Design a protein around this nucleic acid. Structure first.
Ligand SMILES: [Zn+2]
Ligand SMILES: [Zn+2]
Ligand SMILES: [Zn+2]
Lengths: 441, 250, 81, 62, 43, 161, 206, 77, 144
RNA sequence: AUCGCUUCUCGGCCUUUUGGCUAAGAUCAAGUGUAGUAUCUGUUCUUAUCAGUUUAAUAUCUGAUGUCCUCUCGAGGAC
């Protein structure tokens, strides 16, 4: 046999997203990643319709996607960590409508390995360095300087090889023109594999830690470990520098925590649940995705939860410390692979199975007869709340997607001559059987 | 001694064969292995390929091939056809006869273009008559003397050779069907062998091979062995979709 | 013997005796990708030398296309020190 | 017990017989025997095997 | 190369072959060959 | 199991010997362990068919098979031992003849039936080289006048031509 | 009509025979690899296409001479005639033709909203053409994300007899300089290439 | 044997290699960890499991990375 | 452009891999290495399988050049033929009684692992779970 | 026919072994460095258990080789 391979409909499901001014303007662009595809959309503020400008093939796996802005430039580069042993830097040319490869750095072997970097990648909020990281034993850091003609350069990478250590996340902490530094989680399977009893399996603790640059001496020094109470998935970065304090929100199961090193006494808060729900007495609760609106006025986070409920979070802060936490129920939307909270008053809710949505924000999520929650409010018992239909968000746009296509059938099952396709798709309650045909309605 | 207590752990070959789920594998030294349950599950996996013979042996790999005499390599047909070998034989005999002085004389005054052999003869061999040799599929390692081992496990009766036919008295070629061999004669006479009772003889327990002849002289099928009531010795000694490939070139 | 302390962005170079071969595969053909070395085997009197001869850096060490098909070129400064 | 490979290097006879015992059990297992497996409902809405079906069939009911 | 079909010795060159056939172990295996030969065969 | 390959043909190779062993049944051993001098076939060989009845019927079959063109016999491992047999049944085959006349001895020549050459149909006589003269005696005695296929047998010691 | 292709969950397709008169279910031919299949399809009487949980599609064919009726762990086995790393879990194949009178095709529908077709070739002229098209395209227009295309499409088991229509169809969105360079290696005009690119989807799909 | 300095540096270089004494436990646990790192890396087996159980991608990868710690029982002795 | 002469050349390499000398097998192995790296991706994998059958027996060897050209042939053959086929060749001798054979198979499997450690995830066998460990991978046999 | 000879004929395959002469006509034959492989060659091994080291298993290696009388390591016996 001799075959030729053609794709009719690209992959639709979304995995990663970033938002930035990827065309230099202050009209914002969104760069999402399908499976092996990089697709760029620009949401029009007039109708609220998102035009899918540029859809490109990359022939690889996008494991990690993060935009960044150089210190003071007007563009929005992309840093892509994929499954080759390379980090790649991308830009938009609207003149040619094409992604452009600025730089390219090999650091290892191909394929979705385990000790070769690329799974996690973070930047420093100002745009001075990037860190690339694996799920064991390897992380590197790249320094970025405009050249004389301001065309970006990238020097050789740094090192942080530390054996027998997982990583549940890595993120850049917002410092003000100090040495940039990064908060990773960690773990240490080491002992739990030296103990023939399985004791050390239990009794091992995540260690929310910070590595730090030293751009003067040009190395990465281990600053600040701290044994955390319980493993939590990830870390939302606190807008530091001038705005806000520094610090990380550790999104652990049932509990979201502020924490920063130095003098701060570490801040807790249990998660408020919906009331009178029908969920298993055992089932915990984790924060799935997050997105932060940081604006001229102030900042805030949104984080979402398994049953789809969104929450608002802002910082009640005194001089240098923050003092306490307020999570107040915003609304509940589809389960999200990502949220990209625009200015111009929308946010992109990248569905995880099915049609993905664009909501517009109506009220800041503040000052109504929805209750108030806090990290200072003590209790013996929990909070609760009772959800409701869409209050603070209004459903502007709805982009279709087949993800997932759980079954198919070709036939001609209308009286038409040409065949239709009968696609059994979608997950659980949001599933469906959907008819495809070659016609346009 | 601790190796000796693990040596008391060093179970019996019967211990193994009874434990294991697939007992064909279990071999001699299997037991002195640090993890025989693994080793045996592995050796009983699908599609896997066992260690060579010769790790035990004291002689190295083919120092046993040392002894014999061996005949030179035999070219592919489609390369003989293009008639290179005769060119080279002729040039060989020439230059073995010629003497040193004449050799250097030809070094200084060459016989430029003595010979020729045309292209399209070559290019058609290599690009128009090149053909798949005989290959061996996954697993069948070559070991010493393998090419000497004749071949076995064709318990089939119909398997006949042409030298077999000649040196047994039967025919070779298109008549290997219509020729019942001299053993099918006593198959019809007193039966086919009682360990190949799952073998039927052609013309004796099977029907006529294509265009066979009934008769009792030399060259026929004779009496297809039957009971007195008419039912044959076995079987029938007398004789009473859409296979299109999907992707195929025009 | 190998340096192998991990790669960088500094190109390597060849003396003229060593001119032409790949660094490991010892080829003479079809070179595809350029060689990079480590800072430590980059500094000082070792600037611009022959990874093999030690001679002066004049021609560029390269990577035989086989070495790039098998990605034996993703290990770093292979300097025989 | 046949001279099949499965017992080669088992030299003691009680071991051989228990080995071939479990081997026998496994061969009879993985055999598909239509008598006990192949099963027949009578007309009366209840089921038997091939054997019993033909048994009571040809001894005058079915 | 050259062989001794008797002593199963492999030689590069003549001089070595001639020295081989000047029997020392050629001699031993040779006399053994002859001994076992005369063993098996002998109106 | 063990069968005497007698009249073991010289060039009739042990390879095709074992291929016929398989084409008959359990080809487990085909061996003609020859002279320590010659290498060619030594007139009697051991053919093991690991089933006794297999070797038995394979022997009944591969007797009279024309090894080196000559009938060679699978069995248990010229002073006039030829017998004249007349009133002959014309309706026999040659291997049937070898198995009918080989009960009291070997057949060093299959029964040569003195048939007319004009047609190819016999007039009722033959002669057969058996193993022994006492063998021809016993066989010709048990079949003196006795029940042949259609024309009753009449056998005894054969004349010389 | 009377053969079975069972497909276990880890080993492979396994060809099974039903002999009715003895009423047996007996094995004759299986595969030589492990393949965690998710769904298979029949292309003929001897050829079966398979998906795989890790990305791949393969086509496996019985050798032409199978002793269908008879009575390591098998007797005789099948071969592999094509091997492609699609890129996402392929959850349903089907042998079908789309547009009326269009030649046959394989539709594959993945788990991420992707739908596509694998389409045969009729002429070594077509075959050699796109073969060379992409053999140059890899070299002068590599993927964005660092990867090599040959190695991405031979992630698990090497490629065999599949051309990457989605790399070929990138000639359009290429640049005039390179469009030239390559179509001149082909010594056809960028018109010739691009029309021969478009029409092959034209006669199979839309 | 300086080759060995480099070679147990290689054992120190590539988590998952072996040597002639390696134990079924180290072998199978290393292959199990690698299996997890790739279920995470490849964006689509994640959908396979997310959809097979009724979990969601955060749930999925959290389980996986918890399991990454003692995946194949407790240690050997 | 070896996809043409690979067939013509195979029966000569199999000829010289059935012994003729150390150097004979050292050199036929080098030839296999370069053929494999040339014919990467053109489907001539049946021929390289056939020649694996003949190269793999030389695995137990001692002379440095000979065993070294053998190992090279197996890296080339690894990219060209895939890592399933070679993990299957390397399965049974990982846990062998001996130590010479254990060591050669762990040398190979190390080099098969370093390069292409990530395919193997779909090529590992099924290794049953005894009492106090879990060894099967249920992740991979969720149905869907 | 024999036996003695004569001649010739034939057969082996045997044996014979070259173109004369001269100033034996004259003249003359220039490879490494590194290791290492393989091949020849030379050579060396009954001793009795057992313990261990060791090894896939051998082997190797290490370590000693029933008491009492008595006569010449050897012998008949109370044992
Ligand atoms: Zn190299
Ligand atoms: Zn260095
Ligand atoms: Zn140099």
């Amino acid at each position: 046999m001799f075959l030729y391979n053609l794709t009719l409909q690209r992959a639709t499901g979304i995995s990663f997203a970033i938002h930035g001014n990827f065309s230099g303007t202050k009209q914002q662009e969104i760069v999402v990643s399908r499976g092996k595809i990089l697709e760029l959309l620009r949401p029009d503020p007039n109708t609220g319709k998102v035009h899918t400008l540029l859809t490109v093939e990359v022939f690889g796996v996008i494991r990690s996607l993060m935009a960044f802005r150089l210190t003071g430039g007007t563009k929005d580069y992309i840093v892509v960590g994929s499954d080759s042993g390379r980090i790649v830097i991308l830009e938009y040319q609207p003149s040619k409508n094409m992604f452009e490869k600025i730089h390219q750095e090999t650091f290892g072997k191909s394929g979705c390995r385990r000790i070769v970097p690329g799974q996690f990648l973070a930047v420093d909020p100002k745009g001075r360095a990037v860190m690339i990281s694996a799920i064991e034993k390897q992380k590197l850091v790249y320094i970025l300087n405009r050249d004389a003609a301001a065309r970006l350069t990238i020097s050789s990478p740094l090192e942080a090889h530390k054996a027998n250590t997982l990583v549940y996340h890595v993120v850049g902490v917002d410092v003000g023109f100090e040495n940039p530094m990064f908060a990773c989680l960690e773990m240490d399977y080491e002992e739990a594999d030296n103990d023939p009893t399985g004791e050390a399996a239990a009794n091992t603790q995540q260690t929310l830690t910070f590595y730090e640059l030293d751009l003067g001496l040009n190395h990465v020094v281990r600053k600040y470990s701290e044994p955390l109470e319980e493993h939590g998935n990830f870390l939302i970065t606190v807008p530091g520098g001038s705005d806000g304090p520094s610090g990380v929100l550790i999104c652990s199961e049932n509990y979201i925590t502020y924490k920063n090193f130095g003098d701060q006494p570490d801040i807790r808060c249990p998660i408020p649940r919906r009331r009178n729900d029908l969920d298993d007495p055992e089932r915990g609760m984790i924060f799935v995705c997050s997105a932060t609106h940081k604006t001229k006025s102030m900042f805030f986070f949104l984080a979402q939860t398994e049953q789809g409920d969104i929450f608002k979070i802002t910082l009640e802060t005194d001089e240098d410390m923050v003092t306490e936490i307020r999570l107040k129920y915003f609304d509940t939307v589809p389960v999200a692979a990502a949220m990209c909270v625009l200015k111009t008053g929308f946010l992109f809710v990248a569905s995880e199975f099915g049609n993905h949505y664009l909501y517009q924000i109506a009220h800041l999520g503040d000052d109504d007869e929805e209750p108030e929650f806090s990290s200072a409010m003590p209790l013996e018992d929990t909070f609760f709340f009772q959800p409701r239909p869409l209050k603070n968000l209004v459903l502007v746009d709805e982009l279709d997607s087949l993800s997932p296509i759980l079954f198919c059938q070709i036939a001609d099952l209308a009286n038409e001559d040409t065949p239709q396709l009968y696609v059994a798709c979608g997950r659980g309650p949001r599933s469906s059987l959907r008819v495809l045909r070659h016609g346009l309605e | 001694s601790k190796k000796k207590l693990r040596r008391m752990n060093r179970f019996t070959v019967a211990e193994l064969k009874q434990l294991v789920a697939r007992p064909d594998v279990v071999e001699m030294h299997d037991v002195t292995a640090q993890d025989p349950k693994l080793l045996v599950h592995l050796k009983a996996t699908r599609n896997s390929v066992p260690v060579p013979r010769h790790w035990c042996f004291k002689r190295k790999y083919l120092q046993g091939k040392r002894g014999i005499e061996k005949p030179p390599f035999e070219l592919p047909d489609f390369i003989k056809r293009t008639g290179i070998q005769e060119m080279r034989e002729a040039l060989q005999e020439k230059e073995e006869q010629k003497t040193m002085k004449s050799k250097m004389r030809e070094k200084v005054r060459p016989k430029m273009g003595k010979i020729d052999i045309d292209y399209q003869k070559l290019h058609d061999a290599f690009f128009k008559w090149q053909t798949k040799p005989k290959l061996t599929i996954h697993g069948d390692l070559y070991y010493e003397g393998k090419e000497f081992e004749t071949r076995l496990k064709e318990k089939k009766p119909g398997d006949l050779s042409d030298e077999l036919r000649i040196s047994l008295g039967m025919p070779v070629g298109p008549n290997a069907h219509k020729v019942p061999p001299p053993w099918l004669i006593a198959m019809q006479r007193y039966g086919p062998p009682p360990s190949y009772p799952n073998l039927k003889i052609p013309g004796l327990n099977s029907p006529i091979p294509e265009s066979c002849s009934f008769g009792y002289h030399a060259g026929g099928w004779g009496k297809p062995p039957v009971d007195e009531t008419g039912k044959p010795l076995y079987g029938d000694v007398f004789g009473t979709i859409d296979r299109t490939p999907w992707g195929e070139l025009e | 013997i190998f340096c192998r302390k991990q790669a960088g962005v500094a190109i390597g170079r060849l003396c003229e005796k060593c001119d032409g071969k790949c660094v490991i595969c010892d080829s003479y053909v079809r070179p595809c990708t350029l060689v990079r070395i480590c800072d430590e085997c980059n500094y000082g009197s070792y600037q611009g030398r022959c990874v093999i001869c030690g001679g002066p850096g004049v021609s560029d060490a390269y990577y035989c296309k086989e070495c790039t098909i098998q990605e034996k070129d993703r290990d770093g400064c292979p300097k025989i020190v | 017990i046949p001279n099949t490979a499965h017992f080669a290097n088992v030299t003691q006879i009680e071991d051989a017989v228990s080995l071939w015992a479990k081997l026998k059990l496994q061969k009879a297992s993985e055999r598909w025997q239509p008598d006990t497996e192949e099963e027949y409902e009578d007309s009366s809405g209840n089921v038997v095997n091939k054997k019993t079906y033909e048994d009571l069939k040809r001894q005058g009911l079915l | 190369s050259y062989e001794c079909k008797l002593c199963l010795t492999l030689h590069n060159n003549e001089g070595s072959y001639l020295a081989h056939t000047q029997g020392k172990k050629h001699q031993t295996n040779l006399a053994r060959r002859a001994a076992k030969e005369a063993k098996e065969a002998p109106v | 199991a063990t069968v005497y390959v007698g009249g073991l043909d010289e060039k009739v190779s042990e390879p095709l010997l074992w291929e016929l062993f398989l084409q008959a049944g359990p080809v487990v051993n085909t061996h003609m362990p020859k002279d320590r001098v010659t290498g060619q076939h030594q007139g009697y060989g051991f053919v093991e068919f690991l089933s006794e009845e297999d070797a038995d019927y394979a022997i009944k079959i591969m007797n009279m098979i024309k090894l080196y063109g000559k009938p060679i016999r699978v069995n248990k491992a010229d002073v006039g031992a030829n017998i004249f047999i007349g009133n002959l049944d014309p309706e026999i085959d040659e291997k049937l003849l070898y198995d009918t006349f080989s009960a009291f001895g070997v057949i060093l020549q299959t029964p040569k039936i003195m048939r007319d050459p004009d047609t190819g149909n016999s007039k009722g006589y033959a002669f057969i080289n058996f193993a022994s003269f006492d063998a021809s005696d016993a066989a010709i005695e048990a079949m003196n006048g006795q029940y042949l296929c259609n024309r009753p047998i009449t056998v005894s010691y054969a004349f010389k031509k | 009509g009377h053969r079975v292709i069972v497909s276990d969950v880890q080993e492979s397709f396994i060809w099974v025979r039903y002999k009715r008169n003895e009423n047996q279910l007996i094995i004759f031919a299986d595969d030589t690899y492990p393949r965690w299949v998710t769904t298979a399809s029949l292309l003929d009487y001897d050829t079966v296409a398979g998906a795989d949980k890790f990305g791949n599609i393969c086509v496996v064919r019985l050798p032409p001479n199978t002793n269908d009726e008879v009575d390591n762990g098998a007797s005789q086995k099948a071969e592999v005639i094509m091997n492609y790393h699609v890129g996402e879990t392929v959850l349903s194949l089907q042998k079908t033709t789309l547009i009326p009178g269009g030649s046959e095709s394989l539709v594959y529908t993945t788990l991420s909203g992707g739908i596509g077709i694998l389409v045969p070739f009729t002429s070594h002229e077509d075959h050699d053409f796109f073969q060379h098209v992409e053999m140059h395209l890899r070299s002068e227009h590599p993927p964005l994300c660092g990867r090599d295309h040959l190695s991405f499409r031979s992630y698990y088991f090497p490629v065999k007899n599949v051309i990457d229509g989605d790399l070929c169809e990138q000639f359009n969105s290429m640049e005039p300089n390179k469009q030239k360079n390559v179509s001149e290696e082909l010594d056809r005009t960028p018109p010739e290439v691009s029309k021969k690119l478009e029409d092959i989807r034209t006669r199979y799909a839309f | 044997y300086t080759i060995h300095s480099q070679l147990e540096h290689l054992q120190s270089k590539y988590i998952g290699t072996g040597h002639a004494d390696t134990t079924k436990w180290e072998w199978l646990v290393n292959q199990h960890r690698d299996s997890y790192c790739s279920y995470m890396g490849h964006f689509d087996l994640l959908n396979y499991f997310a959809i097979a159980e009724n979990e969601s991608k955060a749930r999925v990868r959290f389980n996986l990375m918890e399991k990454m710690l003692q995946p194949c029982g407790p240690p050997a002795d | 452009m070896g996809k043409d002469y690979i067939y013509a050349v195979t029966p000569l390499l199999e000829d010289a891999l059935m012994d003729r000398d150390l150097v004979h097998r050292q050199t036929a192995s080098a030839v296999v290495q370069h053929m494999s790296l040339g014919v990467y991706g053109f489907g001539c994998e049946d021929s390289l399988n056939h020649l694996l059958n003949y190269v793999w027996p030389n695995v137990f060897e001692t002379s440095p050049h000979v065993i070294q050209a053998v190992m090279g042939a197996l890296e080339g053959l690894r990219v060209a033929i895939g890592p399933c086929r070679m993990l299957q060749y390397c399965l049974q001798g990982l846990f062998h009684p001996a130590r010479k054979v254990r060591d050669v198979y762990w040398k190979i499997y190390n080099s098969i692992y370093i390069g292409s450690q990530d395919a193997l995830i779909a090529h590992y066998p099924r290794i049953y779970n005894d009492d106090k460990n879990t060894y099967i991978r249920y992740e991979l046999d969720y149905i869907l």
